[PDB]
């Protein structure tokens, strides 16, 4: 009978995972490659990238971890006896 006036608060926990945004036209996964990536505006072009984050403050130096999923494939060829050669390659962002 004698409770008080109150307010409400909400939040959530999503540990043990990463936030992933795919590079797809309609966000759906339809193969290892992707339509926008395959278009690249046809790769006679190039582009510069800007990204902006805004997060709540803490009280300690922190790190922002960002990774771009790209292609990283290696081909192995061993022609003669006791000889092995390989070719790595990866894109974009590689060398």
């Amino acid at each position: 009978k004698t409770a008080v006036d109150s307010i409400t608060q909400k939040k959530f926990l999503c540990d043990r995972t990463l936030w992933r945004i795919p590079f797809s036209s309609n966000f759906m996964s339809m193969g290892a490659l992707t339509d926008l990536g395959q278009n690249l505006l046809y790769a006679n072009s190039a582009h510069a990238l800007d990204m902006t984050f805004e997060v709540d403050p803490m009280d300690e130096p922190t790190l922002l971890y960002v990774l771009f999923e790209v292609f990283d494939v290696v081909r192995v060829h061993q022609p003669h006896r006791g000889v092995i050669e390989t070719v790595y390659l990866r894109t974009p962002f590689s060398a």
């Binding site: 795919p22 797809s24 006791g82």
Partner: protein, 682 residues
Amino acid sequence: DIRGVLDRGPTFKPYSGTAYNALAPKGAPNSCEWDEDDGKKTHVYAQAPFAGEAINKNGLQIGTNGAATEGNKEIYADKTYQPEPQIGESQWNEAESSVAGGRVLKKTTPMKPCYGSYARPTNSNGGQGVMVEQNGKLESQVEMQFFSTSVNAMNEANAIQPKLLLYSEDVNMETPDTHLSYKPGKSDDNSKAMLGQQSMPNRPNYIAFRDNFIGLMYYNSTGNMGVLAGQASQLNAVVDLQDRNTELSYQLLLDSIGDRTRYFSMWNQAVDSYDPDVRIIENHGTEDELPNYCFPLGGIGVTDTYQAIKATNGNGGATTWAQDNTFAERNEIGVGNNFAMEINLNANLWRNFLYSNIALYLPDKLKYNPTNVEISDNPNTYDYMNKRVVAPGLVDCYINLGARWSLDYMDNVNPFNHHRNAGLRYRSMLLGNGRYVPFHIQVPQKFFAIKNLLLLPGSYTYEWNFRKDVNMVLQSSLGNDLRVDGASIKFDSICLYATFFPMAHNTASTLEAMLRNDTNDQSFNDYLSAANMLYPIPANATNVPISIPSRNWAAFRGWAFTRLKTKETPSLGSGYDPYYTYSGSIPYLDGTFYLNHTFKKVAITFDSSVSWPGNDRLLTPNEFEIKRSVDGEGYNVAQCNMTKDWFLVQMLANYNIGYQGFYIPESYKDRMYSFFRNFQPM
């Protein structure tokens, strides 16, 4: 294959609580004695549990032999091991005897509470007197003391007889695993008050090898990139860079290709996990509606003597009464309910659990230093963490009652660095609970580029490296540095094993020939397949820019991100770091993360003037919203703070679900490190 020697140092605490006089009350001192002024006399506090037969100047008589000489010569106490603290009466009433006895520590031995007091044995019968060398031999220093009543001296009973006897000895007192809660005196000399100091066990701490032996072998880093190559090639066949977390890689992949809940011994495969109850407090409250009562050992305390009475007929008047002769004149009865005590049970259990599992792990900015105790100044060592003060009133049965919630202080603290971590307990116990372990392991290859190659006959050089640091290759529950405490390790024997197959000769020849042709080369990709960038953030800031100049964007697949707490995040590239002190569970390699719930928004742009995906795809014009705090007009979902749009995007990109109405995705398509599995709204 590796064998060698490992020493964990002093700060290894496998078992919670303690195991030295566990049942004793946490404040009662044991038998002892100390000194006072006028005039320096000695006060003694003890108790004699064991009865005997008789006393004389040579000691206590505890038996006799018929076949002896002096009538039946009296057998006395061989002070070495006589009346032992583990003997006593044999029933609750147990009519009192005439002469008793016991043991007592002398004043020279420092006082300590009973709860957690250990002294090693000295002779084969459990004696504990400090053996001392006299005259070229070993001998003991037991001293017998005698006592009689007080009023004994007050009257003509001058025939004062020795009624009580004690044996005084010295021991090597040790308290391996507890500290002192309260200590009134700054000095250490045993006062009278020093009979009140109470103890408290040290917080438990597990230490072992990390999951899947992560960190043993070098990897992503020119530190010394290992080499597999042809025996006379003189040209390498393996190239690695410095932005390919090979490890996070092997990691997630295991996940996928199978199941993780089952542990496998050989590779120490035991995923770090946290109990659901530790993270979120399901404060249903206690359960009690009945009283609980302890009782006297006889179930009747008081007693009033009484007397049998027989009714003699009062004829023509009031009945008369006389004393019976059949009964004994004195009998004992009681009136009313037997005296007892009340206590709540469930509330105590719940309170113990809450205090032990959550309180001690609170952020350290809410703990104040203790009183009258020494302590270190380095805020990282085991000592400084085991001797702070935590207000139990901060969390008790009356916090967030009947709600599904987590204490907002805790949610920015690594929940995996804990002591209920089942995987941690498994790994720690596998090596055993000692302090000096000769160990023996087998390590798997993890580089994707050759972890599934099919080599062909020949000769090759296979050369690799391993780390010696103790900060990284080990794991500690409390995360305290180990360079300071100094756990050591030394490898001795390292050997390699390989497993061929018994294939028929000509078949192997045919396959090898068919496989040497160039149009049958092998291909591989890493399951992760990504880069690795990291960006600093000064404390108490809000927003971060990132800009990469003009370049190509062939076949780019997309982004993923999260957050990390500097301190605990080895820098990488280099083969060693003097600055790494912490030693919790490294999020950057194990796959544990806890910071995700702390984002507001993120925006993406090409050449600073074109949005993406843009063209009015989403509800907001040009910015991804993750959670707007309260003011949000129509943009929450599932009673959380998350926007509908972000929820939709995550659902789609994780399972291709959403355009046909949401619903729980099926099991196999949602593994341990999925999204939906770990989505707790509160």
